[PDB]
Amino acid sequence: PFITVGQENSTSIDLYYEDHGTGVPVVLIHGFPLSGHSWERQSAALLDAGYRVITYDRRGFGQSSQPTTGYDYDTFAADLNTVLETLDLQDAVLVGFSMGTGEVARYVSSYGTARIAAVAFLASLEPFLLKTDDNPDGAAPQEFFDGIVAAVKADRYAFYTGFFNDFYNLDENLGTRISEEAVRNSWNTAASGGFFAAAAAPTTWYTDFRADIPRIDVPALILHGTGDRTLPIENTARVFHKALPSAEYVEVEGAPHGLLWTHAEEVNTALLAFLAKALEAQKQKLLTEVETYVLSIIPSGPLKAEIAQRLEDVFAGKNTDLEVLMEWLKTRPILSPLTKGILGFVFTLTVPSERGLQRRRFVQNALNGNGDPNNMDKAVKLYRKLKREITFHGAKEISLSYSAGALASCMGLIYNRMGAVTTEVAFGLVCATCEQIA
Amino acid sequence: PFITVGQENSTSIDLYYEDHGTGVPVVLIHGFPLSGHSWERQSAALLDAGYRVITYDRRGFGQSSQPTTGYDYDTFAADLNTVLETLDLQDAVLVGFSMGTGEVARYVSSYGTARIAAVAFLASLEPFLLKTDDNPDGAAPQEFFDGIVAAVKADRYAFYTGFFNDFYNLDENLGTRISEEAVRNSWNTAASGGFFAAAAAPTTWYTDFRADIPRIDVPALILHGTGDRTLPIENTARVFHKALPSAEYVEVEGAPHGLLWTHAEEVNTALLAFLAKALEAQKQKLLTEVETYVLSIIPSGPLKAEIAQRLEDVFAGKNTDLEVLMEWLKTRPILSPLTKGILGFVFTLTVPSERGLQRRRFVQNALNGNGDPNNMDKAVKLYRKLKREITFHGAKEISLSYSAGALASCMGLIYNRMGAVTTEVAFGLVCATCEQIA
Amino acid sequence: PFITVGQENSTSIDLYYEDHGTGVPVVLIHGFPLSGHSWERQSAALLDAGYRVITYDRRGFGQSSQPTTGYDYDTFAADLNTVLETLDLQDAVLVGFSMGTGEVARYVSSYGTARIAAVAFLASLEPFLLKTDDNPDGAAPQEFFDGIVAAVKADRYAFYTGFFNDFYNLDENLGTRISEEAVRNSWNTAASGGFFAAAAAPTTWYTDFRADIPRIDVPALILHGTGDRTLPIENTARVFHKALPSAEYVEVEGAPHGLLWTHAEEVNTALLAFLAKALEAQKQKLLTEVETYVLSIIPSGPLKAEIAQRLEDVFAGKNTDLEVLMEWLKTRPILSPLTKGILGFVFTLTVPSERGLQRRRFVQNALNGNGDPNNMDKAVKLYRKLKREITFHGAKEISLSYSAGALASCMGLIYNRMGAVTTEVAFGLVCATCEQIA
Amino acid sequence: PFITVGQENSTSIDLYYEDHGTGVPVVLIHGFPLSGHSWERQSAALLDAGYRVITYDRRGFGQSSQPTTGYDYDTFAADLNTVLETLDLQDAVLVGFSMGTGEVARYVSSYGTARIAAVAFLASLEPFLLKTDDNPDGAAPQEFFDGIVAAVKADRYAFYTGFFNDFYNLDENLGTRISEEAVRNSWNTAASGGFFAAAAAPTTWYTDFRADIPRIDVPALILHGTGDRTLPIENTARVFHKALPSAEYVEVEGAPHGLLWTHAEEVNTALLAFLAKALEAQKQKLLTEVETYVLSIIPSGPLKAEIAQRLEDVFAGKNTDLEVLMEWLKTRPILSPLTKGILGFVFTLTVPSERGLQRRRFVQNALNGNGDPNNMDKAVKLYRKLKREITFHGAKEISLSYSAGALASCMGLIYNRMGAVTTEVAFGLVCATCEQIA
């Protein structure tokens, strides 16, 4: 999987990326000198939570192309933009690490937050690493960074074993937090990166992000290890917190630079808690929007109030039994048979608890749609398009070009387990079905 | 509904007919001077038993056209042939009444019994009505029949009231077995017949059928009323029974000529019992044929013996619970998931007791067929053709031109209640599904 | 005249129907156990009023085919749907009686009101006949209806004479409101129905229509007799009125179930008055909408005020002469030739009084539309397309994909031959033409 | 080299594969957690024997894409199917190892054996690994496998070194059977796999294959090491041998799981011997079947004996010259001109040694078939269909619906330009041609 973000002579600058899971898109940007595969502990935890994990390899690292030009944050953010634009993400989450934290800051301060819902800074570079007369809060003078560059060009491979010794704090965590095998893979990944990239990357570390900090208008998370040797916490996160007090500040005690692996349990807890708070504000306003379309089929009466409560008590996450709901939904005098099926179909997608039991029949007969051969044929044409779709807005638009009978029958195909589209797309059908019946 | 069976000048000789129900085709041939609608009590009883009732109106009577030529049993049988050939009936049952009994007798001695399974003669004309020197066992001389023709040509409408007085024995059964209203409708039917038909029909009553009797090689049923005034029992059924001793002989006590309405309860019981005996020999040979194809998917072993027993215990009609069956079918180690669905699909079609309950899931997952948009699309094209089909052999041949994945998906459409074909066509799918997996 | 609406085995389910008169389509759906001919008193009055009467026979009744399957309102509405779709009816009125009220209700609640302008319920079944614990407002328990079913299967012909005694109240109205001959004919119709239909029809009377009632968004008329014996007014219309208060409610005192014949003068008066009222409401609601678009092309000034008064005085029905109007319209200083044509085109479609005189020339010269060969060609392509459209909103949409000059030229085509298209469709062009010049 | 087999969100599921050599296609399916390159010792031996080696990397392993969905044998077989269909393999050989044996079993039991000639199971999973109450022949309960899954997500890299310790038996074979360098690379391959794949793959090990076993109708080879630590021989191959006794059973003494490298010499010898034996049996089973049909056209006499020996001397592989054969075939007294052509047609398809003869003329004149314009046209309709056919039974059935003259002319099409079609399909025409002349 590749995304063209540039061009170098006869070759094209392509970035390797992965797109897994369904839900809120979370973009994970790795740091020096690893690849996208270094998020493998965070990806798994986010996928279990129900998020959409999107990781990519930076130019000159991992499985991505290895150009010899465009190694600055204006280009790195530009590359990030192209990735976000191609996948067309809305209300996504940018999570950066080490060198990766710089790309997030430069993008938000240059391209806005039209696509961003929240941000997270793990072991940040912010606000400035270069120690000058203007900022004593730097970590080192220019003579230090220049020494690293000369060391890499000397022997890039030998530099890694010594670098990773301070990256994971092997004298404290090896065999404990991180195995010797895990260190070997991290070495292999760095060696499979661009030779010119590893020599040009350190020259981007001392970039000034001070002008970009106050441009953060989205919920932020500043996280850093206390035992970080590569990036001293006192020269980074401590002064970053002062520039952005509104950001959630979390210190992991006794954590090295590569705390993505060593202190994964610690990072994931603070990260899942941050996402659960900032995204919850957005999560509920779409659920009521679904509730809006569903209630637009219920006739005004005492039931429209009761049905709304049965939905809201489920949308929050309060425990509810399907047997009571499906039976009360069945024995309803005012509700038409068609809308009974749609409500039962929603009730099945909103409750995690199937009870490991049978299927219902009153909904199957409603979602049949008169069993017309030509109307049902237009339902399988829809199923092919819904399997290829990913977003909520994408599913609604496609299933709005089909007849009302087709949508019902298409809802029948997925309910009778003759298909398997995503949860975001599943709601896209219902909301499209309800708009047509007006 | 009409069937062209002839041609007269500028007009075409068409016969009105009806085709109801599914199962063993039973052709009901009415008598003088009523129509096919006079079987409405036998039709209802035959439809509840699970047979396929096919009734048609004879030329010059009922809703059929009213020609002035071709009023003989050689033509009447010829018309019956065209109907049987057009509808393409196999192993059908010919049931005649009054004048109608002559057509059944006349058809069998000319076209064979390739399409006939059994015959039934209610108030027959056989073997001869004309009392001559060759047969003293006649019912009347030529002078009697000639008197009837002259009576009809005098006043065909007035002839009916007097005719129906002895047809239903109104001096005995009026207000008891048959209402005056039912007689009125019977009058209306006779008055809406051909004027020339009613005058030519009696000339066919004294037709000799003695050469046609021994050509009957199928199980027959001779039934007649004892109080029959139009057709004296001693001159018809009594000597008919001697000519064909192998036929089941049943006399209804105190029954008039029109015993189709008056003694319906008596007739329906004797007719269904006769049908239940002659048709049962064929009923079981198709069930074992389904069993034959179904067993061709089960791998040879101890289960193939148990599954055969599970099929036979259901096909006979012994009470069985689906919950035990569906669970035992589910928890089977050797059976593949695909064949589990087919067995469950058969088990659902063979037991009348759904318990008014839910559907099963292990079969739904098997009949999915990998949920491919193109494979499922080939399943709905089949469903359109299966709704229009009627016979078992017809359903099998059509659904044998489609892929195995389509058949599985098509079985899924009907199982998930997204369609509703007949039991005979349902087995046609199963038998087609099992033939392709070989 | 027949319309194929289904398929049963070898036979095709066809429905007999009649199409008389020209004007606003009024579909009359009869009840049990009569035919379309039972509207013969309402039909004559509607034909005299200038409407288009369309009556059809329900499956299993009258001259229609007599199948043994599909006896439910979902099917009855489906048959109704097929009739409405096949005939391509525009702005029609659905009027039901007895069972016919159920077909109207099931259709509106399943297929919408895209083709429906108004509805009428004469002696309705709504909302529920089955008296249960959930609904005490029923008329009888299921044991009563089952007694009816058993009575029909006993002697369908004899059942009719007793049924019609309470249908028309013969012990009260015979020889007065209804003759003995009219009763005799009604019997023949019932006797000419399906034997299976009459035994299956009563099981549809106790169908729940409570879920169908609130889907009624068109002007309705609930009418019922007070002396209705078959359908008690207190168990039907009284509780129906509560479910739909917006419907005009009219009770005929001392009227039986079959009030279509006995109190014909009263019904016809109330029905014609309701249509004349309800259609006037739509006639006027399109005229004020047209006035909005027409005044949106006239430049603000004293004339934009004067033109509005001349329009309102015509739309209301105040007497006006075209000669003064058309001449005063000609000698107008501010109005462009194009907009002069639009006003003249409206004036010809809005006044019933043409005086039986000539056409005008200044508008024909105005409706040319610059005489562009490509614009005029798109106008004849349009005139063919406007004939297949039905709604006002439908007419507007088609004529919105063409240039303003083409619309003007298309208005000339309609000006020369109207019409073809209808006034409701004609205004769709005008409102679209004035909308394009913005 | 990649083959698109699926779709995940924005990315496409592609599989890395290699295609080497020419001849009988041999598909090598690797196991957990290696790649296709682990066959490098088996690949070399198969390429020397004259086979066509086709290896691919399972989704989530090796150089193939790394999705987070579709990790089950139903999907794995589907992927294998897509590979076989895209490459269009006919009479291929499926060889599986570890997880690969499951893919072979699931494919044969789901997609049939139309493309498969023989199968081989090296260190199989069959029939069941999960030890339950239903199957005591398991190796471990579910609690064991769940411990492995938790171990991978803990530290996937460290898990490998311990896994390979029992995979190759490093406490027994290190420095002996397998070098330290070879172990490092095997680690690298596993480390270059999907992080989610390695955590999801073990959950597929305890899959039930008991329903897939009896669908094996092709010659099989069950091979397993005695010192296998990962897959206990007593819980796999031993009970598998009982389920499929017809399969060749071979135990390698003191061989670990990864006996592909350690005991390469033993495996390669036994595998090449099985293929050389099993394919020889079918090649010959088509030759004797053709010989059966060919001798059925020759009249009984000395030639029918002579023709059989000339065939047998060819079927065995004894050197024979065509010039003598084609000339001796010409100068034959009993044989008709028609049958001379058919014999010459067989002789060209059976000898690898063409002798450097362009083609013969006496057969071309024989295969004309009277040169009828309508008959040659029926030969090209067949020729287009035989190219799309793959199997022997498929070619025979199609070419049995044509006249004998058409088959001859069709044989002429194949005789001048073969081919297109293949020899297995070529014999299908011949066997059909000789069968039609009877």
Using the structure block, give the residue that is written with the tokens 């035990």. Answer: B324
The backbone region for B255, taken as left when phi is positive above 0, alpha when psi lies in -120 to 50, beta otherwise, is beta
Helix/strand/coil percentages in chain C, nearest 5: 50, 10, 35
Length of chain D: 438
Phi, psi for A68 (deg, rounded to 5): -115, 15
CA distances from A288 to B84, B216, C98, D81 (A): 64, 77, 43, 44
Chain B residues in contact with C12 (beta carbon < 8 A): 1
Distance in angstroms (rounded) separating the CA atoms of residues A347 and A352:
10
B96 near B32, Cβ under 8 Å? Answer: no
Distance in angstroms (rounded) separating the CA atoms of residues A182 and D369:
75
Length of chain C: 438
Query: Does the beta carbon of B436 lie under 8 angstroms from any beta carbon of chain D?
Result: no
Do chains C and B touch by CB distance (3+ pairs < 8 Å)?
yes
SS3 C11: strand
| Interface with D, mutate which of B300, B343, B370 (most D CBs under 10 A) | B370
Q: What number of C-beta contacts closer than 8 Å exist between A and C? A: 17
Contact assignment for C195 to B21 by CB distance below 8 Å: no
Query: Does the beta carbon of A355 lie under 8 angstroms from any beta carbon of chain B?
Result: no
DSSP state for residue A260 in the 8-state scheme: T
- The contacts of residue A360 (CB under 8 Å, 6+ apart) are A326, A330, A344, B358
| Active-site choice (D65, D98, D109, D399) | D98
Contact assignment for B335 to D134 by CB distance below 8 Å: no
DSSP state for residue C299 in the 8-state scheme: P
What is the identity of the amino acid at B401?
S
Query: Sheet of D248-252: strands edge to edge?
Result: D2-8, D11-20, D52-56, D25-29, D92-97, D116-122, D221-225, D248-252
Q: Is D98 a catalytic residue?
A: yes
Chain A residues in contact with D66 (beta carbon < 8 A): 18
C148 near C202, Cβ under 8 Å? Answer: yes
The C-alpha angle with vertex D328 and arms to D323 and D330, in degrees rounded to 5, equals 100
Chain A residues in contact with B381 (beta carbon < 8 A): 373, 377
Q: CA torsion C134→C138→C143→C148, rounded to 10°? A: -150
Q: Report CA C271 to chain centroid distance, whole Å.
A: 12
Chain B residues in contact with D127 (beta carbon < 8 A): none
**Strands C52-56, C116-122: parallel, antiparallel or unpaired by DSSP?**
unpaired
- The subunits that touch chain D, with at least 3 C-beta pairs less than 8 Å apart, are A, B
Distance in angstroms (rounded) separating the CA atoms of residues A281 and A277:
7
Q: Which residues are registered as beta bridge partners of D29?
A: D56, D96
Q: Which residues are registered as beta bridge partners of D26?
A: D53, D93
- The subunits that touch chain A, with at least 3 C-beta pairs less than 8 Å apart, are B, C, D
Identify the helix (H) or strand (E) that includes residue C427: helix C423-436
SS3 D319: coil
Query: Does the beta carbon of C65 lie under 8 angstroms from any beta carbon of chain B?
Result: yes
- The contacts of residue D306 (CB under 8 Å, 6+ apart) are none
| Alpha-carbon distance A404 to nearest alpha carbon in chain C (angstroms) | 10
Distance in angstroms (rounded) separating the CA atoms of residues A267 and B32:
96
Distance in angstroms (rounded) separating the CA atoms of residues B14 and B402:
37
Query: Does the beta carbon of D81 lie under 8 angstroms from any beta carbon of chain B?
Result: no
Chain A residues in contact with B416 (beta carbon < 8 A): 364, 412, 416, 418
Of A311, A362, A360, nearest in space to A339 by CA: A362
Query: Does the beta carbon of C131 lie under 8 angstroms from any beta carbon of chain A?
Result: no
The backbone region for B128, taken as left when phi is positive above 0, alpha when psi lies in -120 to 50, beta otherwise, is beta
Selecting from B37, B87, B179 the residue whose C-beta is nearest the C-beta of C195 gives: B37
Selecting from A373, A418, A420 the residue whose C-beta is nearest the C-beta of B412 gives: A418
- The subunits that touch chain C, with at least 3 C-beta pairs less than 8 Å apart, are A, B
What is the identity of the amino acid at B223?
L
B401, HSE (Cβ side, Cα atoms, 13 Å): 9
| Active-site choice (C91, C109, C186, C257) | C257
End-to-end Cα distance, chain A: 42
SS3 D299: coil
| Interface with A, mutate which of D71, D149, D157 (most A CBs under 10 A) | D157
The C-alpha angle with vertex C240 and arms to C237 and C242, in degrees rounded to 5, equals 120
Chain D residues in contact with A19 (beta carbon < 8 A): 8-11
DSSP structure string for D75-119: HHHHHHHHHHHHHT-SSEEEEEETTHHHHHHHHHHHH-SSSEEEE
CA distances from A27 to A19, A106, A117, B332, C344 (A): 9, 15, 11, 46, 65
Distance in angstroms (rounded) separating the CA atoms of residues D220 and D239:
15
CA distances from B229 to B35, B98, B254, B259, B314 (A): 20, 12, 11, 11, 48
CA distances from D305 to A11, D301, D311, D327, D349 (A): 70, 7, 10, 18, 21
Of C214, C285, C279, nearest in space to C246 by CA: C214
End-to-end Cα distance, chain D: 51
- The contacts of residue C214 (CB under 8 Å, 6+ apart) are A299, A334, C243
Peptide bond just before D419 cis, omega within 30 deg: yes
B229 near B127, Cβ under 8 Å? Answer: no
Dihedral sign computed on CA atoms, order D246, D251, D256, D258? negative
CA distances from B168 to B58, B183, B212, C238, C290 (A): 21, 8, 29, 48, 72
- The contacts of residue D80 (CB under 8 Å, 6+ apart) are D27, D29, D103, D104, D107
Chain D residues in contact with B333 (beta carbon < 8 A): 134-135, 208, 210-211
Distance in angstroms (rounded) separating the CA atoms of residues C100 and C258:
13
Selecting from B331, B334, B370 the residue whose C-beta is nearest the C-beta of D210 gives: B334
C396, HSE (Cβ side, Cα atoms, 13 Å): 15
Peptide bond just before D136 cis, omega within 30 deg: no
Contacts 24+ apart (CB under 8 A), B79-86: B79/B5, B79/B6, B79/B15, B80/B27, B80/B29, B80/B107, B81/B107, B81/B111, B82/B3, B82/B4, B82/B5, B82/B6, B83/B3, B83/B5, B83/B15, B83/B17, B83/B27, B83/B56, B84/B27, B84/B115, B86/B3
A28 near A20, Cβ under 8 Å? Answer: no
Phi, psi for B149 (deg, rounded to 5): -60, -45
Burial of D330 (0-12, 13-18, 19+ CB in 10 A): middle
Burial of D227 (0-12, 13-18, 19+ CB in 10 A): middle
**Strands C2-4, C14-20: parallel, antiparallel or unpaired by DSSP?**
antiparallel
DSSP state for residue C234 in the 8-state scheme: G
Q: Which residues are registered as beta bridge partners of C178?
A: C174
D21 near D47, Cβ under 8 Å? Answer: yes
| Alpha-carbon distance B206 to nearest alpha carbon in chain C (angstroms) | 33
Selecting from C9, C11, C157 the residue whose C-beta is nearest the C-beta of B185 gives: C157
End-to-end Cα distance, chain C: 49
A96 near A121, Cβ under 8 Å? Answer: yes
Which residue does chain C place closest to A332, by CA atoms?
Answer: C211
Of A129, A105, A106, nearest in space to A119 by CA: A105
Distance in angstroms (rounded) separating the CA atoms of residues C332 and C307:
11
Contact assignment for A373 to B357 by CB distance below 8 Å: no
Query: Does the beta carbon of B400 lie under 8 angstroms from any beta carbon of chain C?
Result: no
Distance in angstroms (rounded) separating the CA atoms of residues B78 and B111:
9
Of B39, B254, B34, B4, nearest in space to B160 by CA: B34
Identify the helix (H) or strand (E) that includes residue D16: strand D11-20
At what angle are helices A423-436 and A404-415 packed, to 10 degrees? 150
- The contacts of residue C107 (CB under 8 Å, 6+ apart) are C77, C80, C81, C84, C94
Q: Which residues are registered as beta bridge partners of C16?
A: C2
Contact assignment for A20 to D10 by CB distance below 8 Å: no
- A 229-288 residues with CB < 8 A to D: none
| Alpha-carbon distance A146 to nearest alpha carbon in chain D (angstroms) | 33
End-to-end Cα distance, chain B: 42
SS3 A382: helix
Contact assignment for B377 to A377 by CB distance below 8 Å: yes
| Interface with D, mutate which of A52, A56, A181 (most D CBs under 10 A) | A181
Q: Is A30 a catalytic residue?
A: no
At what angle are helices C302-316 and C337-350 packed, to 10 degrees? 20
According to the 3-state scheme, what is the secondary structure of chain B?
A: CEEEEEEECCEEEEEEEEEECCCCEEEEECCCCCCHHHHHHHHHHHHHHCCEEEEECCCCCCCCCCCCCCCCHHHHHHHHHHHHHHHCCCCEEEEEECCHHHHHHHHHHHHCCCCEEEEEEECCCCCCCECCCCCCCCCECHHHHHHHHHHHHHHHHHHHHHHHHHHCCHHHHECCCECHHHHHHHHHHHHCCCHHHHHHHHHHCCCCCCCCHHHCCCCEEEEEECCCCCCCHHHCHHHHHHHCCCCEEEEECCCCCCCCCCCHHHHHHHHHHHHHHHCHHHHHHHHHHHHHHHCCCCCCCHHHHHHHHHHHHHHCCCCCCHHHHHHHHHCCCCCCHHHHHHHHHHHHHHCCCCCCCCECCHHHHHCCCCCCHHHHHHHHHHHHHHCCCCCHHHHHHHCCCCCHHHHHHHHHHHHCCCCCCCHHHHHHHHHHHHHHCC
DSSP structure string for C33-91: T--GGGGHHHHHHHHHHT-EEEEEPPTTSTTS---SS--SHHHHHHHHHHHHHHHT--S
SS3 D183: helix
Query: Sheet of B248-252: strands edge to edge?
Result: B2-8, B11-20, B52-56, B25-29, B92-97, B116-122, B220-225, B248-252
- The contacts of residue D367 (CB under 8 Å, 6+ apart) are D341, D345, D408, D409, D411, D412, D415
Do chains A and D touch by CB distance (3+ pairs < 8 Å)?
yes
B380 near A406, Cβ under 8 Å? Answer: no
- The contacts of residue A400 (CB under 8 Å, 6+ apart) are A432, A435, A436
What is the identity of the amino acid at D69?
T
| Active-site choice (A30, A64, A124, A257) | A257
Q: Is A409 a catalytic residue?
A: no
Q: What number of C-beta contacts closer than 8 Å exist between A and D? A: 58
The count of other CB atoms within 10 Å of the CB of residue C82 is 16
Distance in angstroms (rounded) separating the CA atoms of residues B219 and B211:
18
B347 near B329, Cβ under 8 Å? Answer: yes
What is the identity of the amino acid at D7?
Q
B47 near C153, Cβ under 8 Å? Answer: no
Contact assignment for C211 to A337 by CB distance below 8 Å: yes
SS3 A52: strand
Which residue does chain B place closest to C66, by CA atoms?
Answer: B18
Q: Which residues are registered as beta bridge partners of D224?
A: D251
DSSP structure string for D204-262: GTT---TTTGGG--S--EEEEETT-SSS-GGGTHHHHHHH-TTSEEEEETT--TTTTTT
| Active-site choice (B257, B263, B399, B409) | B257
Selecting from B358, B373, B412 the residue whose C-beta is nearest the C-beta of A359 gives: B358
Query: Does the beta carbon of C88 lie under 8 angstroms from any beta carbon of chain A?
Result: no
Domains in chain B with CATH codes: 1-279 (3.40.50.1820), 280-364 (1.20.91.10), 365-438 (1.10.10.180)
Query: Does the beta carbon of B355 lie under 8 angstroms from any beta carbon of chain A?
Result: no
- The contacts of residue D245 (CB under 8 Å, 6+ apart) are none
What tokens were used for A384? 């092919």
Q: Report CA A29 to chain centroid distance, whole Å.
A: 11
Dihedral sign computed on CA atoms, order A198, A203, A204, A206? positive
| Active-site choice (C35, C64, C65, C98) | C98
What tokens were used for C191? 């006797």
Distance in angstroms (rounded) separating the CA atoms of residues C57 and C17:
6
Chain B residues in contact with A368 (beta carbon < 8 A): 417-418
| Alpha-carbon distance C148 to nearest alpha carbon in chain B (angstroms) | 17
Distance in angstroms (rounded) separating the CA atoms of residues C182 and D285:
87
B392 near B286, Cβ under 8 Å? Answer: yes
What is the identity of the amino acid at A356?
G
A32 near A123, Cβ under 8 Å? Answer: no
Query: Does the beta carbon of B357 lie under 8 angstroms from any beta carbon of chain A?
Result: yes
- Go through chain B and list every residue after which a break occurs, taking a C to next N gap over 2.5 angstroms, comma-separated: none
C251 near C237, Cβ under 8 Å? Answer: yes
Contact assignment for B40 to C155 by CB distance below 8 Å: no
